[PDB]
């Protein structure tokens, strides 16, 4: 997207979101990142929404195909096609991780941007871990853990307990513990402590911030209900 203006890329990313054209959205936001300027709060959300939708569809397809493949192991086509989808998913994750590494994270100095990008890094390594089976699943898991942990450390020092980025980070890190790291007790403890500390901070918030925070706290509660 080298020949398109940064502002035009951002504008078209917003149009693509309205049209539910998430592959286009991601390509526009990739082009905007590669302009080399830092991203605003809104622009970070556009980047995240775009790739989350793209990889979300790939993950859903991979799970359908992985399930069919497992039922068959109780021609090569099902394995071959699952492998095709898996490779495409890995390529998208690698692309996002490449954007974070070149050079979003190193230029992110404010807590809001740095925690946002590191949560992103944890998420896309988590997606790689979901399909990993070889000699590097352990290394991929530790890469996810390390990103989430650095983001947690910053968010606990620099953000209030009700901050939606801090809450969503804790939510996804708890899902990492439960689903990836085989640490359901750590997952439950993190979700509980996150929820309780947010509840105690709600009195400080405006009506609109209250709605933002309580929405994510309900997601923590939904998981705790499923896990206990």
């Amino acid at each position: 997207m080298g020949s398109m203006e940064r502002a035009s890329l951002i504008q078209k990313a917003k149009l693509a979101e309205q049209a539910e054209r998430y592959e286009d959205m991601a390509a526009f936001m990739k082009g905007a990142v590669e302009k080399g300027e830092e991203l605003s709060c809104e622009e970070r959300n556009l980047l995240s929404v775009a790739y989350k939708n793209v990889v979300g569809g790939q993950r859903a397809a991979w799970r359908v195909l992985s399930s069919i493949e497992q039922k068959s192991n109780e021609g090569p086509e099902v394995r071959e096609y699952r492998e095709k989808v898996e490779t495409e998913l890995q390529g998208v994750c690698d692309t996002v991780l490449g954007l974070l590494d070149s050079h979003l994270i190193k230029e992110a100095g404010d807590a809001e941007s740095r925690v946002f990008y590191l949560k992103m890094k944890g998420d896309y390594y988590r997606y790689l871990a979901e399909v990993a089976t070889g000699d590097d699943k352990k290394r991929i898991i530790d890469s996810a853990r390390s990103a989430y942990q650095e983001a947690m450390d910053i968010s606990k020092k620099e953000m209030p307990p009700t901050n939606p980025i801090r809450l969503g980070l804790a939510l996804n890190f708890s899902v990492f513990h439960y689903e990836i790291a085989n640490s359901p007790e750590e997952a439950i403890s993190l979700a509980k402590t996150t929820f309780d500390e947010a509840m105690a901070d709600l009195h400080t918030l405006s009506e609109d911030s209250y709605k933002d925070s309580t929405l994510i706290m309900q997601l923590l509660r939904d998981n705790l209900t499923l896990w206990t």
Binding site: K52, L171, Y178
Partner: peptide
């Protein structure tokens, strides 16, 4: 177990 939906913004 639900992660952040993050599909709309």
């Amino acid at each position: 177990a639900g992660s952040i939906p993050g599909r709309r913004s």
